[PDB]
């Protein structure tokens, strides 16, 4: 057992996107592995670790890891320390005093963690930069299947963010908007079946913002502690399901006019799931996440539907299939050959 | 560090299936986190646990756990000796008088481990067992490794790789996928026959990597890959000759070639979101790899691949549907 000594703080108790302050530290330092203990006098109880947090704090960090003594840090400011089993042998009672001299036994360096101090004055400040933790980039500290793409983090990420701002209001759930994102690309691929410019136009321009929204189911996963295996499996699934869904669409409508286009939407198809599928795959075998260093052809997600609503903006759907196709399966194939080593 | 402790035995030096008896009892105990040492004379060096095994033997468990003081038994039969640390304090340099000496201190329990006890007359019998000890499904499980077991016999005493294989058994997707290509019934009955032989040989890797310890993450994440580019490209084969008669068979090519790619990454997304392997526990649709060549293979002799594709088509898609539906539960 881990003991996370919080002391209390009114501030604690302000509602921030969804949530009390106190409840989203508290959910962050037991996701940290600690119990959790709110304190106007401290009171000292067995454990091997203690966890001391004095002045009001958001952590912003997704995957905090505490080994060894040290003392946490925020931009130089002291956000709490991390004291070993034998500050039982120096606590006198007084926090402040057994403090001072826990302090003076020891040389304990100083280590930085993503968090922001609370005050009255900057909770506009602490959502906005909540928000941002959000997004799938290792710089949250976040550990998940793979990261976001370039198209992802510097467009999509940008509009998801402002939605799921509103909805962290709202009983709506993570798994409520993956099928409701999957809707969506449901919608955007009939579009595509009636066969004319308007539908086509429309149909791409429904499909990027499936793109967007389908970031929103795990930005409040996370942002409501809502995070569980099925969601991330059915997410998963279900945008094969919508990339194959699109495709088969785009390719169906295509095929009428000149049926090389089965070849080509076969090719697409399959380039599209097997870029997701080498992903999966090296977390399945690998257990860790997939982020390749260096090239990579951007023909991720993000990408693959942009291109598909780029392309159906200027009327030619067919086009998005042809690039999703060579790019796709380069990627694919260079995957193979750049794993091995 | 803990200290495997292992009395030689000329035994040892006989070949099995590609290694020594030696190199396995020494892999084995390593893979369990174990440091070595073959021994006449026992000379005790310091550790926080002792293994001692005086009798040759091979080792048949593959993930085996030694938590507290032990005795290691197969079928009533000790097998070896697991002490504490406080062995130390016991012996006195004979090793025969220190192992009385710490079992009348102490009440060890029996644990029951899979092990044979080596002698030059039961080493078929090892054999045997060693090949039945290497673990897509219930065809692959029941039908297909009684052939693939003994493949990978004959290649256990060569130099190829796991990955040598998978690349292999790709490669054999490629020719049977071609011989589709020609339409006609006797290179479609060929290629049904080289798709079934192709799911026999698929299995060969994973035998020959346990049986070697040759076993890798990017061996197991290869395998599949190519499966993938295997399924898709055998019903992108027959759906091509069949679309020539009649075009409705790029729609039932489609979503067999989606349905064939879903179950795999159904269940490779739920080892990915889990860190479990996939294994439902009453009803499932059988369409795991193993049956969809099964059926290609068997609707290939017929002449109708075509039938192929429509039940994958329909199996797949429909467990793929239930999969859904029954994880939201577990
Ligand atoms: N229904 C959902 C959707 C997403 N999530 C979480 O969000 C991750 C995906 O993030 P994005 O939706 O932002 O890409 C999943 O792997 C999972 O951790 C969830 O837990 N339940
Ligand atoms: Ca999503
Ligand atoms: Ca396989």
């Given at each position: 057992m881990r003991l996370a000594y919080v002391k209390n703080h009114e501030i604690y108790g302000e509602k921030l996107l969804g949530l009390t302050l106190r409840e989203r530290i508290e959910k962050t330092l037991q996701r940290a592995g600690f119990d959790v203990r709110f304190f106007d006098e401290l009171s000292l109880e067995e454990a091997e670790d203690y966890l001391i947090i004095l002045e009001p704090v958001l952590i912003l960090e997704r995957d905090l890891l505490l080994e060894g003594r040290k003392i946490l840090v925020s931009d130089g400011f002291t956000v709490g320390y991390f004291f070993g089993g034998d500050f039982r042998t120096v606590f006198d009672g007084n926090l402040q005093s057994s403090i001072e001299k826990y302090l003076s036994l020891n040389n304990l360096e100083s280590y930085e963690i993503w968090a922001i101090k609370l005050s009255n004055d900057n909770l506009k400040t602490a959502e906005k930069l909540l928000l941002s933790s959000l997004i799938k980039?290792?710089?949250?500290?976040?550990?998940?299947?793979?990261?976001?793409?370039?198209?992802?983090?510097e467009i999509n990420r940008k509009v998801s963010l402002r939605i799921s701002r509103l909805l962290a209001d709202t009983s709506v759930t993570p798994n409520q908007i993956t099928v409701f994102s999957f809707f969506l690309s449901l919608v955007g691929s009939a579009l595509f079946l009636l066969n004319?410019?308007?539908?086509?136009?429309?149909?791409?321009?429904?499909?990027?913002?499936?793109?967007?929204?389908?970031?929103?189911?795990?930005?409040?996963?996370?942002?409501?502690?809502?995070?569980?295996k099925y969601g991330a499996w059915l997410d998963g699934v279900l945008d094969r399901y919508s990339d194959f869904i699109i495709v088969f669409s785009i390719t169906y409508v295509l095929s009428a006019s000149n049926p090389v286009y089965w070849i080509i939407?076969?090719?697409?198809?399959?380039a599209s799931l097997m870029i997701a599928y080498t992903g999966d795959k090296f977390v399945a075998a690998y257990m860790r996440t997939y982020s390749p260093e260096g090239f990579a052809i951007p023909i991720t997600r993000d990408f693959r539907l942009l291109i598909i609503f780029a392309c159906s903006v200027v009327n030619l759907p067919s086009l998005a299939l042809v690039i999703i196709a060579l790019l796709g399966n380069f990627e694919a194939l260079r995957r193979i050959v750049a794993l091995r080593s």
């Open positions: 980039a290792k710089r949250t500290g976040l550990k998940p299947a793979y990261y976001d793409g370039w198209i992802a983090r004319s410019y308007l539908t086509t136009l429309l149909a791409g321009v429904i499909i990027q913002l499936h793109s967007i929204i389908d970031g929103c189911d795990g930005e409040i996963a996370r942002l409501k502690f809502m995070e569980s939407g076969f090719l697409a198809a399959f």
